[PDB]
PDB file of C-alpha atoms in Angstrom:
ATOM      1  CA  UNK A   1     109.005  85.674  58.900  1.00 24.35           C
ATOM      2  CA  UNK A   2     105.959  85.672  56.558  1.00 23.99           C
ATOM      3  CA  UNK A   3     104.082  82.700  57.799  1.00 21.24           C
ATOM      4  CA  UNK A   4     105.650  82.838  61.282  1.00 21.40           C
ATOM      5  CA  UNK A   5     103.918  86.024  62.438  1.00 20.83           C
ATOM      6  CA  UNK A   6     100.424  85.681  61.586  1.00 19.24           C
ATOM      7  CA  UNK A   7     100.263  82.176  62.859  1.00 21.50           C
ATOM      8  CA  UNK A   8     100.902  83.334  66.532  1.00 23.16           C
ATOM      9  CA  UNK A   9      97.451  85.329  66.811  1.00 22.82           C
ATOM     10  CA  UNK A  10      95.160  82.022  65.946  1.00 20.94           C
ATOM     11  CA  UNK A  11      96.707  80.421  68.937  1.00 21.84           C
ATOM     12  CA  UNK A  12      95.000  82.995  71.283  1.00 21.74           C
ATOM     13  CA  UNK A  13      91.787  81.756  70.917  1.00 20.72           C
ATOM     14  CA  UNK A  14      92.362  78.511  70.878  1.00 17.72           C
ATOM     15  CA  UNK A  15      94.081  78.721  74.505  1.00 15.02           C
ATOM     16  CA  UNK A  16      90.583  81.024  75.838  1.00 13.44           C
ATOM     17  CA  UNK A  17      87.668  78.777  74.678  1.00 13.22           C
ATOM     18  CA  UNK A  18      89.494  75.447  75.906  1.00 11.42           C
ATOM     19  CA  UNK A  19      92.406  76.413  78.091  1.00 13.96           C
ATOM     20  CA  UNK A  20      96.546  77.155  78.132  1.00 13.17           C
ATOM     21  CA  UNK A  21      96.718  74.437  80.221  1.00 12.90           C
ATOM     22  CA  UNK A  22      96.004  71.809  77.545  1.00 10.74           C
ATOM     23  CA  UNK A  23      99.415  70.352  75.918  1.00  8.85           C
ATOM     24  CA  UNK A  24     101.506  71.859  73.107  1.00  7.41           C
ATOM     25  CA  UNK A  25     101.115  68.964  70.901  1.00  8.45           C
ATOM     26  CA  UNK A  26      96.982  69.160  71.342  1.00  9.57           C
ATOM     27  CA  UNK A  27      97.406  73.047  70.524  1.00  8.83           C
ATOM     28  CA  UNK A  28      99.240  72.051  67.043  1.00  8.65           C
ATOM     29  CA  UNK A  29      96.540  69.471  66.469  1.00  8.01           C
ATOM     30  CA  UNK A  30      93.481  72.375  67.253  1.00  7.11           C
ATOM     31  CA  UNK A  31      95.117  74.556  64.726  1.00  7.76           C
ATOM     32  CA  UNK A  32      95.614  72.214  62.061  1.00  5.20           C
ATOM     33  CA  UNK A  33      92.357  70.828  62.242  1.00  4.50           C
ATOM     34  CA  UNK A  34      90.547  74.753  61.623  1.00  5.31           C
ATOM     35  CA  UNK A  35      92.896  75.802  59.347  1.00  5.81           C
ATOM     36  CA  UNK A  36      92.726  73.129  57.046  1.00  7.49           C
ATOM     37  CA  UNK A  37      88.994  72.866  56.476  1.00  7.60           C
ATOM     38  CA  UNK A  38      88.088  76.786  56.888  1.00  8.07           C
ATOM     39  CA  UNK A  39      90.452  77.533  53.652  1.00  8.81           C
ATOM     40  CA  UNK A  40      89.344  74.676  51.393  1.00 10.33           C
ATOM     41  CA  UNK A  41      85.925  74.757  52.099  1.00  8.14           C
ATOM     42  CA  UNK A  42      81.665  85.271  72.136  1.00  8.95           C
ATOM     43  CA  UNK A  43      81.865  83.319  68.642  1.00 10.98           C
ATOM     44  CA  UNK A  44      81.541  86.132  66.537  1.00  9.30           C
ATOM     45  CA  UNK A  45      84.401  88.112  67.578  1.00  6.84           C
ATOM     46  CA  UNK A  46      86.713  85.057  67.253  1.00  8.81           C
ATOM     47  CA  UNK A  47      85.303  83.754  63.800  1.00  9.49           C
ATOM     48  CA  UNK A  48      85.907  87.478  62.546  1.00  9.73           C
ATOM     49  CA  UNK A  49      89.322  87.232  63.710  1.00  7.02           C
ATOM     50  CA  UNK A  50      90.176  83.788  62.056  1.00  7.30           C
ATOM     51  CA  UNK A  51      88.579  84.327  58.584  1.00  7.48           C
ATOM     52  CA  UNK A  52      91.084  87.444  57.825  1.00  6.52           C
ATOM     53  CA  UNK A  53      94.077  85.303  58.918  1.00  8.81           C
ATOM     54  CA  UNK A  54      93.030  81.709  56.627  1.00  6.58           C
ATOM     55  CA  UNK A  55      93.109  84.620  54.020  1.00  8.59           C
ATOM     56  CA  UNK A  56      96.686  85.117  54.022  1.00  5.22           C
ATOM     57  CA  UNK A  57      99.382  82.557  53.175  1.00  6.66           C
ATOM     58  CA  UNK A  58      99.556  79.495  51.215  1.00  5.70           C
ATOM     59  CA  UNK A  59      97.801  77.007  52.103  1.00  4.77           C
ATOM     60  CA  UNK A  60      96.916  73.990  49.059  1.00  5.54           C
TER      61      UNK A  60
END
């Protein structure tokens, strides 16, 4: 319940710039591949969004 509710807004963007229609297992893939390199370390609106939500949780 922690992890699995904030995880379902990132997924919105991804399916606007690119598309819904791409598969599930490309949509894991294009959230993996922000999240993991954005916490180690219309664009704005979406980069504002993301940076609040690689905030929260573990993550290495």
């Amino acid at each position: 319940p922690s992890n699995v509710e904030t995880y379902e807004q990132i997924l919105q963007w991804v399916t606007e710039v690119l598309g819904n229609d791409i598969p599930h297992d490309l949509i894991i893939g294009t959230a993996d591949i922000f999240i993991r390199q954005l916490k180690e370390n219309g664009i704005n609106i979406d980069s504002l969004k993301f940076n609040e939500l690689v905030k929260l949780m573990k993550n290495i």
